[model samples]
Target: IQIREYKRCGQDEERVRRECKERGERQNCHYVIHKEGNCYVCGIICW
Candidate 1:
């Protein structure tokens, strides 16, 4: 299985889930989203 995770800005957990859900749906991979403060950032781990 492949895991594609991402982090989002803000103090709302739902925002992260929302972003992750939208991206995950389009990517068609498992999305584990997390909120890590107010910053625009993204990364990936190749498997």
Candidate 2:
């Protein structure tokens, strides 16, 4: 699977789940989020 990473700012866990859900519906992939320095990052893994 190819994974894509994106840097995010001013995002909370609530928003992350919402974002991931939408992407999974149309994109058919898995999403993850974790802390990075003083911000957050998004991980999109497509199978």
Q: Find the candidate with the highest lDDT and give its number.
A: 2
lDDT by residue (1-47, candidate 2, tens digit) is 79887766776766765776576666888877777655666778898
TM-score of each: 0.46, 0.64
Off by over 4 Å in 2: none
Local distance difference test scores for all models? 0.52, 0.72
RMSD of 1: 4.4
Q: Candidate 1, residue 37: CA error in Å?
A: 8.1
How many pairs of residues collide in each model? 0, 0
Where does the lowest 10-residue lDDT sum fall in candidate 2?
33-42
- The regions of model 1 sitting more than 4 angstroms off are 1-5, 34-47
lDDT of 1 by residue, 1-47 (tens): 55544545664666656666667566655455443566433333333
lDDT of 2 at 34: 71
